[PDB]
Amino acid sequence: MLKYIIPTIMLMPLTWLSKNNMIWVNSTAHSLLISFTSLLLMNQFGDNSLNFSLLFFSDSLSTPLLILTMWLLPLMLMASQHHLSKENLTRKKLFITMLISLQLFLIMTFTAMELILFYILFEATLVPTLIIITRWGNQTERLNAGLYFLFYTLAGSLPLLVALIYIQNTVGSLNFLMLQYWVQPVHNSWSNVFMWLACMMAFMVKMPLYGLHLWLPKAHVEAPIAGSMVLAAVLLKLGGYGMLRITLILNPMTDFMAYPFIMLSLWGMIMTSSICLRQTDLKSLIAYSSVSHMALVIVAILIQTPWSYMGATALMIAHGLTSSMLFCLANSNYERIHSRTMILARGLQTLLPLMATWWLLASLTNLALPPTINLIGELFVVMSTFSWSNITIILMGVNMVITALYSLYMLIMTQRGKYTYHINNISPSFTRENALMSLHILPLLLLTLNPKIILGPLY
Amino acid sequence: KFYIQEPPHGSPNWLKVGLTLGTSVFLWIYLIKQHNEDVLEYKRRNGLE
Amino acid sequence: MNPIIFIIILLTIMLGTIIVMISSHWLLVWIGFEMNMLAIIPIMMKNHNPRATEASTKYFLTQSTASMLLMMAVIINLMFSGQWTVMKLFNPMASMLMTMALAMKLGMAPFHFWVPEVTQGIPLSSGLILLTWQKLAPMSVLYQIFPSINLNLILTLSVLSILIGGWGGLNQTQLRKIMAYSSIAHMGWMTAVLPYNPTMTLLNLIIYIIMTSTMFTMFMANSTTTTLSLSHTWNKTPIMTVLILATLLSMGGLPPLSGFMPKWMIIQEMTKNNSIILPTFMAITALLNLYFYMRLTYSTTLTMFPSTNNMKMKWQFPLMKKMTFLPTMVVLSTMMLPLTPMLSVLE
Amino acid sequence: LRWQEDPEPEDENLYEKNPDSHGYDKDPAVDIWNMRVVFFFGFSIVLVLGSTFVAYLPDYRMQEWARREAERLVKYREAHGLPIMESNCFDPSKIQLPE
Amino acid sequence: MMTGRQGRATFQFLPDEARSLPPPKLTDPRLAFVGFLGYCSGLIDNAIRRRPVLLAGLHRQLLYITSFVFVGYYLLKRQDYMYAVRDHDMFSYIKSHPEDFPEKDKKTYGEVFEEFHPVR
Amino acid sequence: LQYGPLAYILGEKATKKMTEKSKLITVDGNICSGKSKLAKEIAEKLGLKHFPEAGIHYVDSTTGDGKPLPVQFSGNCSLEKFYDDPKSNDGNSYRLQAWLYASRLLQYADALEHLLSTGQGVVLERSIYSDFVFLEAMYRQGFIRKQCVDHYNQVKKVTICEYLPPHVVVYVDVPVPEVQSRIQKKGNPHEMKITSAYLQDIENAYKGTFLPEMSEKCEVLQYSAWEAQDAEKVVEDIEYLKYDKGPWLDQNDRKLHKLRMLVQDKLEVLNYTSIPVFLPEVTVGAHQSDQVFQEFTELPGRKYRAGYNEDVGDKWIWLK
Numbered sequence A: 001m002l003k004y005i006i007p008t009i010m011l012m013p014l015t016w017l018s019k020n021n022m023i024w025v026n027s028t029a030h031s032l033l034i035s036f037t038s039l040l041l042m043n044q045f046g047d048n049s050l051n052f053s054l055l056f057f058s059d060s061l062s063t064p065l066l067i068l069t070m071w072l073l074p075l076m077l078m079a080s081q082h083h084l085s086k087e088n089l090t091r092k093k094l095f096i097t098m099l100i101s102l103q104l105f106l107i108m109t110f111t112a113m114e115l116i117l118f119y120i121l122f123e124a125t126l127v128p129t130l131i132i133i134t135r136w137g138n139q140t141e142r143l144n145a146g147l148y149f150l151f152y153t154l155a156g157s158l159p160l161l162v163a164l165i166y167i168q169n170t171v172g173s174l175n176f177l178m179l180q181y182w183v184q185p186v187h188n189s190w191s192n193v194f195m196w197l198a199c200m201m202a203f204m205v206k207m208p209l210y211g212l213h214l215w216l217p218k219a220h221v222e223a224p225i226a227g228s229m230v231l232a233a234v235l236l237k238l239g240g241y242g243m244l245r246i247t248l249i250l251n252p253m254t255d256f257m258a259y260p261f262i263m264l265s266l267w268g269m270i271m272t273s274s275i276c277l278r279q280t281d282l283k284s285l286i287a288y289s290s291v292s293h294m295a296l297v298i299v300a301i302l303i304q305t306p307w308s309y310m311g312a313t314a315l316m317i318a319h320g321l322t323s324s325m326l327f328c329l330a331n332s333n334y335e336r337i338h339s340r341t342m343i344l345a346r347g348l349q350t351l352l353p354l355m356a357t358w359w360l361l362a363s364l365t366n367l368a369l370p371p372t373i374n375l376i377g378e379l380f381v382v383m384s385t386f387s388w389s390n391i392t393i394i395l396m397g398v399n400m401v402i403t404a405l406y407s408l409y410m411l412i413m414t415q416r417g418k419y420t421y422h423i424n425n426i427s428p429s430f431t432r433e434n435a436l437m438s439l440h441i442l443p444l445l446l447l448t449l450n451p452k453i454i455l456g457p458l459y
Numbered sequence B: 001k002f003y004i005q006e007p008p009h010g011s012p013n014w015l016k017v018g019l020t021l022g023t024s025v026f027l028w029i030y031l032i033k034q035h036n037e038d039v040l041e042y043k044r045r046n047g048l049e
Numbered sequence C: 001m002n003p004i005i006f007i008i009i010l011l012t013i014m015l016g017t018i019i020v021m022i023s024s025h026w027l028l029v030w031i032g033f034e035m036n037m038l039a040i041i042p043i044m045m046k047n048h049n050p051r052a053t054e055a056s057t058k059y060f061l062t063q064s065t066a067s068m069l070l071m072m073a074v075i076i077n078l079m080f081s082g083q084w085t086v087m088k089l090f091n092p093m094a095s096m097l098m099t100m101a102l103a104m105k106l107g108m109a110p111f112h113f114w115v116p117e118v119t120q121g122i123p124l125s126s127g128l129i130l131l132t133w134q135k136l137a138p139m140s141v142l143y144q145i146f147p148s149i150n151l152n153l154i155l156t157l158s159v160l161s162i163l164i165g166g167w168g169g170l171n172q173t174q175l176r177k178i179m180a181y182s183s184i185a186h187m188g189w190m191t192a193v194l195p196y197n198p199t200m201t202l203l204n205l206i207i208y209i210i211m212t213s214t215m216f217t218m219f220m221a222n223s224t225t226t227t228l229s230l231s232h233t234w235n236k237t238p239i240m241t242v243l244i245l246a247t248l249l250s251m252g253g254l255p256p257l258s259g260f261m262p263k264w265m266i267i268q269e270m271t272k273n274n275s276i277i278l279p280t281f282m283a284i285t286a287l288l289n290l291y292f293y294m295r296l297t298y299s300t301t302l303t304m305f306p307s308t309n310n311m312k313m314k315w316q317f318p319l320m321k322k323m324t325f326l327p328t329m330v331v332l333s334t335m336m337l338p339l340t341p342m343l344s345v346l347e
Numbered sequence D: 001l002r003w004q005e006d007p008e009p010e011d012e013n014l015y016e017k018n019p020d021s022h023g024y025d026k027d028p029a030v031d032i033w034n035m036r037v038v039f040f041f042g043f044s045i046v047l048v049l050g051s052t053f054v055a056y057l058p059d060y061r062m063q064e065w066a067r068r069e070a071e072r073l074v075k076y077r078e079a080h081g082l083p084i085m086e087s088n089c090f091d092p093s094k095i096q097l098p099e
Numbered sequence E: 001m002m003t004g005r006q007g008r009a010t011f012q013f014l015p016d017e018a019r020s021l022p023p024p025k026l027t028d029p030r031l032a033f034v035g036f037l038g039y040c041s042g043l044i045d046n047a048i049r050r051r052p053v054l055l056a057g058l059h060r061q062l063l064y065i066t067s068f069v070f071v072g073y074y075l076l077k078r079q080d081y082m083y084a085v086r087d088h089d090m091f092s093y094i095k096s097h098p099e100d101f102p103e104k105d106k107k108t109y110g111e112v113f114e115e116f117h118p119v120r
Numbered sequence F: 001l002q003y004g005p006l007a008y009i010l011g012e013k014a015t016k017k018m019t020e021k022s023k024l025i026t027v028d029g030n031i032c033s034g035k036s037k038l039a040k041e042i043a044e045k046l047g048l049k050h051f052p053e054a055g056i057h058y059v060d061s062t063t064g065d066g067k068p069l070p071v072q073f074s075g076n077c078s079l080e081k082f083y084d085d086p087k088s089n090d091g092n093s094y095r096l097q098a099w100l101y102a103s104r105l106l107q108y109a110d111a112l113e114h115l116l117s118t119g120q121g122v123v124l125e126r127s128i129y130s131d132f133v134f135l136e137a138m139y140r141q142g143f144i145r146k147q148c149v150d151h152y153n154q155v156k157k158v159t160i161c162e163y164l165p166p167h168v169v170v171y172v173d174v175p176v177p178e179v180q181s182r183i184q185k186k187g188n189p190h191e192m193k194i195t196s197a198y199l200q201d202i203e204n205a206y207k208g209t210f211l212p213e214m215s216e217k218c219e220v221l222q223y224s225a226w227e228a229q230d231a232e233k234v235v236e237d238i239e240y241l242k243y244d245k246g247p248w249l250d251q252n253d254r255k256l257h258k259l260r261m262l263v264q265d266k267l268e269v270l271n272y273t274s275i276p277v278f279l280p281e282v283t284v285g286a287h288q289s290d291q292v293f294q295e296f297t298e299l300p301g302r303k304y305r306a307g308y309n310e311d312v313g314d315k316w317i318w319l320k
């Protein structure tokens, strides 16, 4: 992984040593080159994972998450450089540095062989994320959002640290390959119940699990646009990636310990989907949409079937591109009208025709139109959950109806009807904005041609 | 001359500069010497060639 | 003070501590504490005001009471063993007395009340000595008598210190009071692991000293003693706000910073001894400290508080305080986690 | 007036000073280069060449090999009157049951 | 735990038996990281005193790197010595107490019974 | 060797440099009292260093190239705007007074540092000790609020306690009607708007508060407008003073070392002039102060510590 870690680190001197007026050009160009080389991680084998060294490895689960991560950095630089245009040079460079450091921690997080190396980098991502939210967020609420983000994550992750060290003392190793062969079944005792919760709650909070999600509508809404993109696209998926890994050592206890969290997710997805119908803040609506989608990933991971694991991997990738696109679309309106209220600016299809096409495509992927990879992931999860219990099709079916309703409600409210008379500063869409949207949707639809590369290790 | 008052660091402290560079050279030479003897003594005690 | 006399007094503070650390005889340990207390009182009184006199008096009363209890423990130990060797004590009553005496000297809860008040009442440089160098001698004694220490007593003192330190710091706006409660909380980690692995007591002590030294030095560089006076730093020395941010996050124990290392290594040792509940409780309770460290970062680095017009005059002059070792300390306070296995040099 | 604070600046229209703006930078030359690197490295390189690279991945995860291997085994086993597949994954003669 | 080692030459940074161990390589990645920390300290020193960060006082920056690398080298020698001593003690004890560390007669998976927990 | 404890231990002690001529003299009086003319005369005859009265740009004159800086780097303090609109709601009146107190505080530390380091006496025109007369005059005319006076007294309380008062206070007494006549002669359009009520309040503060207080700790010499013209007589009187009161007699090398350590570090001098008391007159929002601070560093010779600025011809930076 050093062929990706070292180039990522070099983005920092590149940013600091660049000419003042070339910081965005230079960092964007070279971050795209790194993203291009990440395609070499697609050398996956049917039986064995691609094991680089004692520290790092990549299998079909981490590889797509790595490619998404490295793809997101140039998109975030494009999304940020407009609203940071009046920031002074040194603070711009520090903003880019936080983004680079977050990428460094993420790519090492997804390839860490040892769960305690995974833990340190998994917590490490908090620091740059907190700084981005609180320093460069726009509203007073960013300070409160940072505290909710920080202490929800740590309340869960500190018990995880105790559990992981306990496992290493008992097994002798936290190396993930070793745990595949030395894993022992978990006896059903009270002490193992709390080991199970310690190993899972930190990941549940990051998903987020319904009930433990209050940090997300604060953090995702108060962050700057780059903060929201990475928060929704990648950082929510650390929880899914962590759960997909750690459930290996929790069988068979997951059979019954899953029930309370499956109920929270199956009912929670309907609750959060309903909330979207009455949200007044466009960014807040998009944030609650993420909670509903990640409820499917939680359920898929907990029922532990080959189909649910393929579906979960696809959804995580599909949601990452879609939710990031929606935040970027919402941000482009915000940079014009300087409000997040959804009813403020209406009929934007009349004033911004091409941008209204991006809204439509973003909405259709969000409601999982076939054959998008959003639908492929959702379908595979619904199939596996039907086998877990036929009755689940009712909750899955209702959620798909509600999801269509709020996805198109967002489209209709903002893009259709009559334009707001007094809003007269809706200038034409910039080339930058149009390129930013198409760099989300084009890869998303291309993956429909070759879905296997985002179906994970069970494929 | 630009400054109304002569800065304390208007010109180099050539004494400190000389003692700073000499100290770096000494430590580097001493460190290399130490390392070479440790390798020699490690080889002698382990009967290595 | 005459600068030469100030140097001699500081060297005597160090000599008292060194005597405690090299002594094999209980009388010489007691003498080291006496010498140390005598030499530190002047540096607390050096600015001559009623608050400095009150702090010196409160400190003197606390330390003198502790030193009499220490001597009582030594004499009881002599009566039941006929010897003076600094080692495990041979009577449970002597053990309790010495443990309490050392807890009083450390300012551990519930013997903690003097630490916030004494620190607040003295200059920043004196507070730096009080919260760093003064911990060395009591810790070095605890390091040698720990096999005879009552397990419940020492763990009770640790839990209370972590709780009181965390809660006490939440209500503070004075920087010196924040550092005092932070010291009390960090004290509880050092003693909590002492029964299991005294080497991790030393690791936490060293890293705590480095981070605390870094914080006091940065507070001294701008002569800031309150939260609101520190909130002006962004408009005078912006680099200092970044350094303060990194150190405060490190003191909060956040990965991948240096301050996580002691918490990480202590949790490991306690879990090896089947102590699961206590490290989990300690780790969670430490979130209190992270909260009032984060509050400082909000008012110092991550937002910009209102400035004053006269601040413009300060822009025209350079920092002339020595800030000794600050570049080295701040790097060690933050970037040492990759070198964690080096803790074996303390074994 | 309460504190001395600057009034909020009015929002600048990039098109006003540069009707050909791409939205990347206020400097027209830097603005054009930012567009070119994004479109070249973004679409020409990553999306086009990356799409081609993915399309020609050498038997990703052994699926084509497995099909050829399955054909070989089915041909062999049917040509010898053997079952196409057996319920036991492991030979029972290597297994020692309890009791 | 290792304070009273039988062969502990007390209050010695590197006892003589440490000379039997291979020295850290001057290209050791941990030593390179220590040098990097020294270089960061040099940059911070310029920053807090408002000198040009990268160019100011190259002599001072060099002494930051040298002193960190110099101290780092000896700390790594002691670090490696202390882990060598830990392993030496562990293996000697295991030899002296064979009754406490018996070689297990360990069976194949064909012989050992593990319960099956269906995932359905 | 830069002064410090080591230089002190090596024999750099103030009692060696100072003599019976090492006196700190301040000349006070009302506006247009001729205090400035006398102060230059006293300084020359006695061989003392003269400090022109600290104005808005005194600090500029001691740093950088020594030339005044644009007004936004003083906060837009304007003496002229104080005379055109003393009740302006932008807070200029107290913002000016607070800035001038800090300027005098800086100048006083500069005067002490010269006196202690070189042993030569100094002559000042007004000081931090008499600065309050203008504050009282502003307050009594309603130019500033009572909160502003409280802020000033808070700042003065924790700054003036650190210094020694002048050896000699020379007051030039000129009646208000004569001062008013002399202002008209000087022909300054803004200064001509000063009222007799304002000038009278300055006089009342000088005679009711200042002179009684300084008499207990300094040698106070009073002169009419006519007597002050004869600087030879004034200098003669200063030379035959006894100097038998005041804290200067209780000073030794140890206490002067501590004083010198303070006055040399100008950020320690100004530390409390910016206490976080949010008074609208002196409070600046983050957006404004952020903007102005960045422009300050963009000035010639201001980006880096003095001696590290290539744009003004500094050399050997890679070895400094």
Ligand SMILES: CCCCCCCCCCCCCCCCCC(=O)OC[C@H](COP(=O)(O)OCCN)OC(=O)CCCCCCCCCCCCCCCCC
Pocket (backbone or CB within 6 Å): A188, A193, A210, A211, A212, A256, A257, A259, A260, A261, A263, A264
């Ligand atoms: C809103 C806040 C958000 C945060 C949520 C936090 C969720 C934490 C949940 C922790 C609960 C963990 C369970 C601890 C109880 C002990 C578990 C146990 O060991 O019981 C075993 C037994 C298994 O039963 P059985 O399947 O029959 O055994 C195998 C034979 N077939 O036990 C069983 O019968 C299995 C069933 C256990 C689950 C019970 C579910 C209760 C009903 C659903 C509640 C949903 C969650 C409610 C949250 C509200 C919080 C205010």
Ligand SMILES: CCCCCCCCCCCCCCCCCC(=O)OC[C@H](COP(=O)(O)OCCN)OC(=O)CCCCCCCCCCCCCCCCC
Pocket (backbone or CB within 6 Å): A016, A017, A018, A019, A020, B021, E026, E031, E032, E033, E035, E036, E039, E054, E055, E058, E059, E061, E062, E065, E069
């Ligand atoms: C002989 C005299 C005595 C002193 C000799 C000591 C030298 C060694 C001390 C360290 C100094 C390293 C060299 C620093 C070069 C700085 C030169 C410089 O400041 O010029 C700036 C240069 C070009 O920048 P420019 O194009 O002019 O403007 C861009 C606007 N943004 O920008 C640059 O190109 C600077 C490039 C960065 C500097 C190099 C970074 C070095 C990293 C060191 C890592 C340490 C690892 C240690 C491991 C050791 C293990 C054994």
Ligand SMILES: Nc1nc2c(ncn2[C@@H]2O[C@H](COP(=O)(O)OP(=O)(O)OP(=O)(O)O)[C@@H](O)[C@H]2O)c(=O)[nH]1
Pocket (backbone or CB within 6 Å): F029, F030, F031, F032, F033, F034, F035, F036, F037, F053, F079, F082, F096, F097, F100, F131, F134, F191
């Ligand atoms: N508001 C205010 N104005 C001040 C202050 N000090 C001086 N001034 C003004 O600065 C101007 C010049 O000060 P003066 O020295 O008293 O006037 P002058 O003409 O020089 O009189 P002489 O020097 O004695 O001959 C006057 O208009 C004063 O009002 C002050 O502390 N506050």
Ligand SMILES: [Mg+2]
Pocket (backbone or CB within 6 Å): F035, F036, F053
């Ligand atoms: Mg005048």
